[PDB]
Design a protein around this ligand. Structure first.
Ligand code: HEM
Ligand SMILES: c1ccc(-c2cnc[nH]2)cc1
Length: 373
């Protein structure tokens, strides 16, 4: 894999993300680093409004630009939603909206907190010399004390990284197919299946670091966007940058290149059809870093692994292929249980479109099994 910005040990996540910005931006950093406090004491908005319009020209490298996206994104979420009890600002102050929009066009990402920001760039290692384990990690920014942003963002990060291990065998898969190396292809498919099965284990930690009520009533609020959102009907106005208000979806793992890439690799047509689930996943690609979305479609232009495995009358291959698919539905099935516990139940103390969306995606995955009938 070339410079698709894919690291060998971290995958789509940003390797060792930057934690500090040039002193020239101390005003931004101070607000983002103290969000839990500023929101609760109610001085967050007045503070955002007192900011001077800072130039983004002093953000030279990619990492410092990513850190800034994270900072401005977290601040924007806090500004728009406030204490997150219903009072919402419909206009983002030009002194913040402008740098954020310019920085966004530069990185080719919408001006709203995105998965690539709050997960892929929002972490650090406590001990540089220890492994990437929950116990040795922390997020750079949270919204409110007790919002469980650490558990949510990091466990997502950890799942992403476990899945990354298979991203590196993708090349082996395509080489083996054209070189007609049957044994190599089988070994590769089984390896991918193993990595996806491990990611499922990682996913288990979500119960240990995220509490249903804090997640549902707090975190969820700050990660909402303004596209098809009732309380921000026409969207948000980025004062000084855009004439009318603009609609943008909130953070979602549907913006994760990781799960989208294996569906492509395996020939599962999540994006096909005109259905709502497909439109959503197709649209989420606009929220992924440009390098990552280029990876996704470079995968789509490679010959089909599915057709190859099918055209051969090789049970070994069919089974290795199916193990990969089976691993994806297992993950999606597990994730349904999680949505039931962290969203359905807390909301019970409409939102069925949610479960149907997830099931549609899972059913499309199951349908791809070859040897099921
Ligand atoms: C508190 C736990 C979690 C909840 C409540 C949750 C909730 C949701 C919801 C509501 C959606 C639907 C679309 C949207 O609104 O963005 C969704 C989609 C998705 N989530 Fe989660 N999620 C959780 C944890 C995770 C974790 C740890 C991962 C792993 C990185 C993950 C991966 C995905 C993916 C890939 C999709 C898109 C559809 C698919 O490929 O099946 N989620 N999630
Ligand atoms: C950050 C981390 C994970 C998510 C998410 C999980 N499931 C759907 N979106 C959204 C933002």
């Amino acid at each position: 894999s070339k410079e698709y910005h894919i690291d060998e040990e971290v995958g789509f996540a940003l390797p060792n993300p930057q934690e500090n910005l040039p002193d020239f931006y101390n005003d931004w950093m101070f607000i983002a680093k103290h969000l839990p406090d500023l929101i609760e004491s109610g001085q967050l908005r007045e503070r955002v409004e007192k900011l001077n319009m800072l130039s983004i020209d002093h953000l030279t490298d990619h990492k410092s630009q990513r850190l800034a996206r994270l900072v401005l994104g977290c601040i924007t979420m806090a500004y728009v939603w406030g204490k997150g009890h219903g009072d919402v600002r419909k206009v983002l102050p030009r002194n913040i909206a402008v740098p954020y929009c310019q920085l966004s066009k530069k990185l080719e990402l919408p001006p709203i907190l995105v998965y690539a920001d709050c997960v892929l760039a929002n972490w650090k290692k406590k001990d540089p010399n220890k492994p990437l384990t929950y116990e040795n990690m922390d997020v750079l920014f949270s919204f409110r004390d007790g919002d469980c942003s650490k558990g949510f963002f990091l466990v997502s990060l950890l799942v992403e990284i476990a899945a990354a291990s298979a991203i590196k065998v993708i090349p082996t898969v395509f080489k083996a197919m054209q070189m007609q190396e049957r044994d190599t292809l089988l070994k590769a498919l089984l390896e991918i299946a193993s990595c996806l099965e491990k990611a499922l284990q990682v996913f288990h930690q979500i119960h240990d670091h995220v509490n249903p009520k804090a997640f549902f009533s707090v975190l969820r609020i700050y990660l909402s966007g303004w596209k098809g959102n009732p309380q921000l009907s026409d969207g948000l106005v980025y004062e000084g940058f855009w004439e009318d208000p603009k609609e943008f979806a909130g953070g979602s793992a549907g913006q994760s290149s990781v799960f989208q890439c294996f569906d492509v690799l395996l020939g599962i047509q999540q994006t096909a059809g005109g259905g709502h689930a497909a439109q959503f996943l197709q649209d989420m690609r606009r929220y992924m870093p440009p390098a990552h979305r280029n990876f996704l479609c470079s995968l789509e232009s490679n010959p089909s692994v599915r057709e190859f495995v099918l055209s051969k009358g090789d049970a070994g291959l069919r089974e290795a292929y199916d193990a990969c698919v089976k691993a994806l539905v297992s993950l999606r099935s597990y994730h349904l249980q999680i949505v039931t516990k962290y969203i359905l139940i807390p909301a019970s103390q409409g939102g069925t479109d949610l479960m149907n969306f997830l099931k549609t995606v899972r059913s499309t995955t199951e349908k791809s099994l070859l040897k099921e009938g």
